[PDB]
Short mmCIF file of C-alpha atoms and ligand atoms in Angstrom, two decimals:
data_model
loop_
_atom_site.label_atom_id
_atom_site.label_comp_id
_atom_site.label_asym_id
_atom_site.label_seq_id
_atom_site.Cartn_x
_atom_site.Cartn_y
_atom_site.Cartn_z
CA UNK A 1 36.80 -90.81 -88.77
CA UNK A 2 34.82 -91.78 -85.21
CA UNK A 3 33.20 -95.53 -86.16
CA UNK A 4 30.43 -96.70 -84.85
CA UNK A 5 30.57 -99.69 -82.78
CA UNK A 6 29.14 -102.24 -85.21
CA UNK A 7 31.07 -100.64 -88.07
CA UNK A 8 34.26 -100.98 -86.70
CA UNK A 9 33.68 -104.62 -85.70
CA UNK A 10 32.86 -105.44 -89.14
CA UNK A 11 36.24 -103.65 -90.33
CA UNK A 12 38.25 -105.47 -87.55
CA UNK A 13 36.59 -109.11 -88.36
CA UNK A 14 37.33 -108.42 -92.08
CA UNK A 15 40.75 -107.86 -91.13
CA UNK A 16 41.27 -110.95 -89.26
CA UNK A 17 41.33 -109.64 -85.66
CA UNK A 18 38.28 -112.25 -84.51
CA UNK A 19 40.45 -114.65 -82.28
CA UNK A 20 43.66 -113.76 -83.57
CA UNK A 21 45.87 -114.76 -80.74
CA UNK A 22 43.17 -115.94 -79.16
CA UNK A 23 41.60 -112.93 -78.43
CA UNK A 24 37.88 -113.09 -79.32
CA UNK A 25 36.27 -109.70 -81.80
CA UNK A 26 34.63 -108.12 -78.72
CA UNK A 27 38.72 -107.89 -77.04
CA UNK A 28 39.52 -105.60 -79.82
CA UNK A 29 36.49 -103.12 -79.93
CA UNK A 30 36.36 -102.79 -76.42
CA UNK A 31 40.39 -101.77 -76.64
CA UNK A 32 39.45 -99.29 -79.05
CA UNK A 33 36.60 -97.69 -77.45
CA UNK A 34 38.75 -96.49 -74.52
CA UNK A 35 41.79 -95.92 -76.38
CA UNK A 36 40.69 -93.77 -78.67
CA UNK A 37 36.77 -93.85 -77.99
CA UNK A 38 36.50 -94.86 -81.81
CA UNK A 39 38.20 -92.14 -83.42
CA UNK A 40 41.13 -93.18 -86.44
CA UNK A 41 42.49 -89.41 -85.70
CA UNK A 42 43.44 -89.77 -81.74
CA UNK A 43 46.37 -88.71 -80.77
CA UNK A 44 48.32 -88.77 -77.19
CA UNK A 45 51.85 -87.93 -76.11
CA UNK A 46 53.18 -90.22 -73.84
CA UNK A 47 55.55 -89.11 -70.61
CA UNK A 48 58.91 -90.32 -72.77
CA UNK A 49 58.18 -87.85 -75.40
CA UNK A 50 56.90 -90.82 -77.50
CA UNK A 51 52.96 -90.53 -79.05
CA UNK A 52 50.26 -93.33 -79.71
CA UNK A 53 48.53 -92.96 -82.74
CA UNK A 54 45.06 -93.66 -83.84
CA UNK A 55 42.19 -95.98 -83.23
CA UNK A 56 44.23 -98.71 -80.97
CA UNK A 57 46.95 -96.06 -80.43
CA UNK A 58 50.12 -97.54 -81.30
CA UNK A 59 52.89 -96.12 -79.80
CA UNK A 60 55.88 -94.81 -81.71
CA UNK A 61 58.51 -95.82 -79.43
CA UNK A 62 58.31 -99.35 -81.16
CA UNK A 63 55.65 -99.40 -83.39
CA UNK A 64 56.06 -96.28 -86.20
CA UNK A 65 58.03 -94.04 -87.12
CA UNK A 66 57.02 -90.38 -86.86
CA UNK A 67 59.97 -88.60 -87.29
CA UNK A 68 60.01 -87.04 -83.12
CA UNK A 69 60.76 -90.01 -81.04
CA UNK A 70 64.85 -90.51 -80.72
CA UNK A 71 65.68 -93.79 -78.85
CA UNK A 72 62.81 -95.31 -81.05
CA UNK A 73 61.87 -98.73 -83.34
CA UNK A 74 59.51 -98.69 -85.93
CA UNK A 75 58.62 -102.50 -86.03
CA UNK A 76 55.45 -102.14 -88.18
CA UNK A 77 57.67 -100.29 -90.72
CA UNK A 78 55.63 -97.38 -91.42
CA UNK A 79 54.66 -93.72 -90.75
CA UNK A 80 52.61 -93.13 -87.60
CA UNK A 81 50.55 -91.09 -90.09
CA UNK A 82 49.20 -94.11 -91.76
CA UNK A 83 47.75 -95.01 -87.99
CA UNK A 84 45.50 -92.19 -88.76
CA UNK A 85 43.27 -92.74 -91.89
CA UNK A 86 39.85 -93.64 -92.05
CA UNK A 87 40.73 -97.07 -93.16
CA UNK A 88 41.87 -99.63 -90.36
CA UNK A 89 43.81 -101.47 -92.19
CA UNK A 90 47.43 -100.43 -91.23
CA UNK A 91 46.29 -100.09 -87.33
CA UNK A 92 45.04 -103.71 -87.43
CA UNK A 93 48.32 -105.33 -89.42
CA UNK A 94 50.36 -103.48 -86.54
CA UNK A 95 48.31 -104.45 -83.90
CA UNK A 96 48.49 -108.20 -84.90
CA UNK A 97 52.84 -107.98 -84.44
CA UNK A 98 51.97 -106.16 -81.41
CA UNK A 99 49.77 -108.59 -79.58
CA UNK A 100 52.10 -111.47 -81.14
CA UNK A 101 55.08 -109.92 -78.96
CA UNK A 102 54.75 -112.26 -75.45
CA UNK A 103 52.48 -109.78 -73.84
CA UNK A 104 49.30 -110.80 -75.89
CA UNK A 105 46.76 -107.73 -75.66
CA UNK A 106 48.63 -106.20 -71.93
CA UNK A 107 50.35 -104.19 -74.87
CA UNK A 108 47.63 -101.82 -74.60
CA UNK A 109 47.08 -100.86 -70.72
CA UNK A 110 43.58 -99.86 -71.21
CA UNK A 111 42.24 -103.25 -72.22
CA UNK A 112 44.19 -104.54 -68.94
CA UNK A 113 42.69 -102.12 -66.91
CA UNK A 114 39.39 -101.69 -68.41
CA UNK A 115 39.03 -104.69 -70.72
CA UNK A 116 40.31 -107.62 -69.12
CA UNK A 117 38.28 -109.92 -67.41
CA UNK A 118 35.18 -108.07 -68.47
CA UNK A 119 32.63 -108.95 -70.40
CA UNK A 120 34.26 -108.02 -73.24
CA UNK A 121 31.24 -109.82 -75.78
CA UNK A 122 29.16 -107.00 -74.91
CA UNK A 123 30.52 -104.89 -77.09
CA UNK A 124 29.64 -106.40 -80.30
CA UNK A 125 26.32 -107.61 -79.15
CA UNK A 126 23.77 -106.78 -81.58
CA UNK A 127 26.12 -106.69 -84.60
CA UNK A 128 25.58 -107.85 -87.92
CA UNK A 129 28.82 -110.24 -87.95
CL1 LIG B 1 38.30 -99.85 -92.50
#
């Protein structure tokens, strides 16, 4: 499923992603957008041979298991597969142990590179929230 902007700020809020760790709603959508530019079915294969799945691709050489990744944790204890559905709701319980790990949201290098220090509110302006 691609979500729209607002719609996927709703699903994260409802979640409990608005300030968790600190990091305010607008953060997490903006992480999203250039992870997986909205979409719960992105997939990308990292140099190690590990892959990040879904809409805040999560990386299976901690996060999930998906069966292809030998030196490999999967912290979140579930299927990379699960990263994938429509619903949010396994991304978003992962990504709260991920950004609770010491490096806060620099666990995703797009929202340190493209996020950070921005004006991250932008991203939910206009949304019913
Ligand atoms: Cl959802």
């Amino acid at each position: 499923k691609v979500f729209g902007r607002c719609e996927l700020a709703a699903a994260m809020k409802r979640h409990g992603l608005d300030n968790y760790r600190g990091y305010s709603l607008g953060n997490w959508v903006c992480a999203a957008k250039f992870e997986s530019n909205f979409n719960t079915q992105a997939t990308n294969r990292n140099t190690d041979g590990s892959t990040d799945y879904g809409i805040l691709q999560i990386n299976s050489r901690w996060w999930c298991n998906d069966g292809r990744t030998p030196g490999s944790r999967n912290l979140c204890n579930i299927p990379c597969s699960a990263l994938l559905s429509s619903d949010i709701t396994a991304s978003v319980n992962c990504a709260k142990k991920i950004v609770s790990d010491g490096n806060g949201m620099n666990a995703w290098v797009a929202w340190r590179n493209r996020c950070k220090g921005t004006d991250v509110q932008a991203w939910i302006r206009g949304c019913r929230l």
